[PDB]
Amino acid sequence: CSMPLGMESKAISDAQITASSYFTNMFATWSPSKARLHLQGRSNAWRPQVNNPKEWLQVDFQKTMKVTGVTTQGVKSLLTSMYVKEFLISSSQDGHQWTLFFQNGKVKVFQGNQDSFTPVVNSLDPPLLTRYLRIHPQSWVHQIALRMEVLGCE
Amino acid sequence: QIVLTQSPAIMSASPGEKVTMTCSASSTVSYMYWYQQKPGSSPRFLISDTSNLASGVPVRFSGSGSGTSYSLTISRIEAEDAATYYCQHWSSYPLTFGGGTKLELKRADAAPTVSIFPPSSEQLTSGGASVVCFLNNFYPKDINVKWKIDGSERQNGVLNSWTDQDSKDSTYSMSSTLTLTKDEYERHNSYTCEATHSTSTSPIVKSFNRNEC
Amino acid sequence: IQLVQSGPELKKPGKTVKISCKASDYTFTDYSLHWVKQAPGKGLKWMGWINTETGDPAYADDFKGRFAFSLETSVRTAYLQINNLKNEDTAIYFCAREDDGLASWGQGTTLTVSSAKTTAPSVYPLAPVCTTGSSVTLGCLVKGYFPEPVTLTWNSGSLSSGVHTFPAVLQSDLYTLSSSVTVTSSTWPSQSITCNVAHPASSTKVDKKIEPR
Ligand SMILES: [Mg+2]
């Protein structure tokens, strides 16, 4: 039950992907919908307006889905590699009240990326069942940048 | 999955005029892209990200909209803007084009210039005989040709081809070709091409005799 | 930015064709590539895309089955294979480099699926009868070839103004095409006017001097 729910394919449409903020100006736009695994082009990743631990990227499956894992990836920009090392996951079913993802009682800190091109998979165990997924970067190298895929099924 | 619907399908405008054409999504998209295609050519990138002119594109072009409604505008249309215009989105699977808005240029009505040509000798030496008649630089596009041989009309053996709107002078042309056998052709002396066009109640006709000329 | 697709293809129903798409620069694994299909009277249909950094292809619903996208990164080329060809595969295939839109397009590749034979054209001069006034219209008829394309030029290309070339019309498995040219009577027949026709598929390369009757 570990299928790509449509970040890369865009079965998860642009408007289902949002965030607390994103980095943009005259030359570049690193919007939430850029957070699609293996995306190419310029500005091929989500980037928050600013770098801190209170930021998040949100996916709205619009349906209830069984999420079994997430895959994350960094990006290289102007010869510099940016990526998220550690992140938290929260979830909701109304998009206002958010449930942290715990494991062994404690709040789960996932180990994400160590470079900018290699994708890294993280299981959700136990399988999370939700409409709204959130990912919260907590540490990172140089800057917060994210391309991702949600793995699951109906 | 989002569908794109463009209106109008065909539209018409005089040089200098403004045209707006619309593109409605079935659901919100992030940006809308636009393309121009002239017949026989590749499509060409006009507008990136809903309202930015792609590289090399003249400034009489502009796009706008958001949500599910977008539009392209050409502020002061020129003759070379005759084309089909496509909108396109990539906000979800699958990538989709609209079905195209075809822009035709209105111009001064022009009657066809007609010319007729007898079978060539080389063709005759082979048992075929083609009579060709050119109907050039007329407007509007709707035209009718009929062939007649020594007074009496003739329907089949006839083959016709229309050009697309000229990107310079905005006219249309048509070639008509009536094919025969060398035997059949040599039975008759007068051949005639009849062009009926809305410029006149009376057709433009050309003729030849395989005698004399 | 340029993308250069390979040339026209005539294929037998049920066979396989592989169309290529070569890129000019090497910013190549930096942008995604798309395939778009255009059928004669239709607009544009997205076939799908391929990731140039990873090689991952993705197909549109209507193209899951007998289509394959692929690459050769060393030579900066994307490929499109079609298996078990049917009549409905007859069309133009474009490739496109995605860059905040489909920003560059290849010139297209016509595919014709048909069991019909390659047939060479005959080229006939069209001299006017007899000429009349200060300008005269000449012509050229290209008859009975298969498949498309032919190229036609006047005097190798030097005479291009005043020219009307007409799209090929198909009957029954044979194309016919024609071209007219208008010049000054002081120029013809004194000066020389030659019709230049090439049909690569049947390695045909003819020149017909238009000669007065
Ligand atoms: Mg912002």
Author numbering:
A (entry chain M): 2174 to 2327
B (entry chain B): 1 to 213
C (entry chain A): 2 to 131, 134 to 216
Give verbatim excerpts from the published study on this entry.
Hemophilia A is a blood clotting disorder caused by a lack of functional blood coagulation factor VIII (fVIII), a protein cofactor essential to the intrinsic pathway of the blood clotting cascade. Coagulation fVIII is a 2,332-residue glycoprotein that is expressed with the domain arrangement of A1-A2-B-a3-A3-C1-C2 prior to proteolytic processing. Following vascular damage, fVIII undergoes proteolytic activation by thrombin or factor Xa (fXa) to form a heterotrimer (A1/A2/A3-C1-C2) that dissociates from vWF and binds to activated platelet surfaces, where it serves as a cofactor for the serine protease factor IXa1516. “Classical” antibody inhibitors are defined as inhibitors that block the binding of fVIII to vWF or phospholipid surfaces, which have been demonstrated to involve partially overlapping sites on the C2 domain.
In this study, we have determined the X-ray crystal structure of a classical anti-fVIII C2 domain inhibitory antibody (3E6) in complex with the C2 domain from human blood coagulation factor VIII to 2.61 Å resolution. The asymmetric unit contains two C2 domain/3E6 FAB complexes, which were built separately due to structural changes in the FAB elbow angle. The overall structure of the fVIII C2 domain/3E6 FAB binding interface is highly conserved. Upon superposition of the C2 domain and variable domains for each binary complex with the C2/3E6 portion of the previously determined structure of the C2 domain/3E6/G99 FAB ternary complex, the RMSD for complexes 1 and 2 were calculated to be 0.328 and 0.383 for Cα atoms, respectively. The most significant deviation in the C2/3E6 binary crystal structure was present at the elbow angle between the variable and constant domains of each complex. The C2 domain epitope consists of two loops, Glu2181-Ala2188 and Thr2202-Arg2215. Conformational changes are present, however, for the sidechain of Arg2215. In the ternary structure, Arg2215 makes an optimal salt bridge with Asp100 of the 3E6 heavy chain. In contrast to this interaction, the C2/3E6 binary complex 1 indicates a single hydrogen bond between Arg2215 and Asp100 while complex 2 shows Arg2215 to be projecting away from D100, out of hydrogen bonding distance. Taken together, these data suggest that the binding of the 3E6 antibody serves to decrease the dynamic mobility of not only the direct 3E6 epitope, but also various loops either adjacent or on the opposing side of the fVIII C2 domain structure, thus potentially decreasing the entropic cost to antibody binding on the non-classical face.
